[PDB]
Enzyme design. Structure first.
Site, PDB file in Angstrom:
ATOM      1  N   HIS C  57       0.819  -1.210   0.000  1.00  0.00           N
ATOM      2  CA  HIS C  57       0.000   0.000   0.000  1.00  0.00           C
ATOM      3  C   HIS C  57       0.853   1.260   0.000  1.00  0.00           C
ATOM      4  O   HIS C  57       0.458   2.286  -0.558  1.00  0.00           O
ATOM      5  CB  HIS C  57      -0.928   0.030   1.215  1.00  0.00           C
ATOM      6  CG  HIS C  57      -2.107  -0.882   1.098  1.00  0.00           C
ATOM      7  ND1 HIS C  57      -2.306  -1.951   1.945  1.00  0.00           N
ATOM      8  CD2 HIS C  57      -3.149  -0.887   0.233  1.00  0.00           C
ATOM      9  CE1 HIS C  57      -3.423  -2.573   1.609  1.00  0.00           C
ATOM     10  NE2 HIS C  57      -3.953  -1.949   0.572  1.00  0.00           N
ATOM     11  N   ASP C  87       0.204  -8.195   1.369  1.00  0.00           N
ATOM     12  CA  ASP C  87       0.447  -6.758   1.433  1.00  0.00           C
ATOM     13  C   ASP C  87       1.930  -6.413   1.625  1.00  0.00           C
ATOM     14  O   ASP C  87       2.265  -5.336   2.112  1.00  0.00           O
ATOM     15  CB  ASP C  87      -0.378  -6.134   2.560  1.00  0.00           C
ATOM     16  CG  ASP C  87      -0.425  -4.625   2.473  1.00  0.00           C
ATOM     17  OD1 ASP C  87      -0.161  -4.089   1.375  1.00  0.00           O
ATOM     18  OD2 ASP C  87      -0.726  -3.976   3.496  1.00  0.00           O
ATOM     19  N   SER C 162       3.705   1.629   8.678  1.00  0.00           N
ATOM     20  CA  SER C 162       3.557   0.471   7.733  1.00  0.00           C
ATOM     21  C   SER C 162       4.808   0.182   6.960  1.00  0.00           C
ATOM     22  O   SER C 162       5.375   1.074   6.336  1.00  0.00           O
ATOM     23  CB  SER C 162       2.431   0.738   6.739  1.00  0.00           C
ATOM     24  OG  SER C 162       1.240   0.987   7.475  1.00  0.00           O
TER      25      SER C 162
END
Lengths: 207, 214, 213
Positions: C57, C87, C162
């Site tokens: 992402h 991811d 992240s």
């Protein structure tokens, strides 16, 4: 460096000791039959008596208790106390149960490391870590341990234990009042274990 | 033999050493509407720095006070006098006059704070009474330009709330690391991002304000 | 008391061991010839060759990926591959001097209750270290993450974390921070619920993206 023989700092001992006695509590209502509210509870002794919160089990058609070992039981409501917000349940004790460690002589101290154990947002049993932030906290005349161990919707009725796995309190509230449209962080409340034990005893006696 | 001495992991030592010296600070203004009665307009925390009764707090906690009240954890309550304030660092110094001995905050002038150190934040969030929260030093300052706009903040994830300002950040030994001052509160709600004035700068500013008042 | 000789409790050893290998990742895009930061996250340098793990992402739709090390070096990164199922994404930098790498102990089994540190760049404040524990090491039954192998942690995770590292008190990689939980029941804000891809899986998925894509 070679950390292969080094030992990671950990509170896994407390987890192994206490977590098996902390259960998922399901308030189920007629849909067929679905889950309305969920929370947590603590198996207090071999008789099958469980402490949870009253708001978790209110107006339930059926209370279900799920243990971490995979067993599921229908729980009966023994009693509840609105003054302290505790409720006692009773499940089938036959077959043996894990129970929460209790040290009746342990005095909780501010700064003691504590772990909160419960089922937030139905993610499954969750361990979070903080310290005892304050003791003797409170319309209301209640007495609470305050903690910054992260406590969320679903944690109510669950256990707060120290690094030895000894029960310090029952997680009940999360402060969320905002002066300035900002959000409170790390302010949670638990019913001290001595008070909780007393309330449970009275409720069991039905007195 | 039947009662053994295993004890839980705890930062209570740091609490016993540091907490008595952290006070609840009340900013009070008189009200025209009800008999000129003094009422609380702001509240925060403060740190007793020496036996003379000098106390550090945040300037924004004591701004525009008609009366500043200082409450100790032992139950004593005093009216404090504003000695001075510094807007550049948002620090203010107060003075109380006590008969008995005052508890003071442990200070190790030679201790160098390190990223990863366990710290406790001590203050009075939301006027619940003195609260201890636990985190670590997330950062000890910044080389590059950043959203804080400053280069010497201690960042910590020990939970800090409204009311904590002016209070103490201490290590596991009870030694003063910084003065809690800011929280990153709006962006998504930020979590575990708080800032303190390093104790070295807070001590230098205090001495300056006591000497000059400026 | 005289505490001058006592030693403050600290996870600084873990910090010195792991933090240098965690990078700031910048997803730049065009919006004019001038590029602007569109998204920012973190990343972990996995080996001396310059392979870096991050979150997919973070680097999606990037016109240019920038990687910044805590030692001051800045590189343009190449997207090696991405895996939607987990991811994860892999980057590659081309460096001369020698690279700091994340400590990995393939035989370490993460346990619930273990102290962990999250390392990343929340809100572009700069590298930030936060402390919590492992709240859970995967799930047996169906649950709101939709997956069975997440490490859950209450180490404060924020936007910008992240792709960054979750390590234990020894500096050993436990996971790659990926999700933080923001789903509210009735207005309240979730606190201390975060998720990371376990390091064993992260290693495997990297190796496969490196050779295949």
């Amino acid at each position: 460096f070679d950390s292969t023989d080094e030992t990671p700092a950990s509170y896994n001992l407390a987890v192994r000791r206490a977590a098996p006695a902390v259960v998922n509590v399901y308030n189920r209502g007629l849909n067929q039959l679905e889950i309305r509210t969920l929370g947590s509870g603590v198996i207090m002794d071999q008789r099958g008596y469980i402490i949870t919160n009253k708001h978790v089990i209110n107006d339930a058609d059926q209370i279900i208790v799920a243990l971490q070992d995979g067993r599921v039981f229908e729980a009966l409501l023994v009693g509840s106390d609105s003054l302290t917000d505790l409720a006692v349940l009773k499940i089938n004790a036959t077959g043996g149960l894990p129970t929460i460690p209790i040290n009746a002589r342990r005095v909780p101290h501010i700064g003691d490391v504590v772990l909160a154990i419960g089922n937030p947002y139905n993610l499954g049993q969750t361990i979070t870590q903080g310290i005892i932030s304050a003791t003797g906290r409170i319309t209301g005349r209640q007495n609470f341990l305050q903690t910054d161990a992260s406590i969320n919707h679903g944690n109510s009725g669950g256990a707060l234990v120290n690094s030895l796995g000894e029960l310090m309190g029952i997680n009940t509230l999360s402060f969320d009042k905002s002066n300035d449209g900002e959000t409170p962080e790390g302010i949670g409340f638990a019913i001290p274990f001595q008070l909780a034990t007393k309330i449970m005893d009275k409720l069991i006696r039905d007195g």
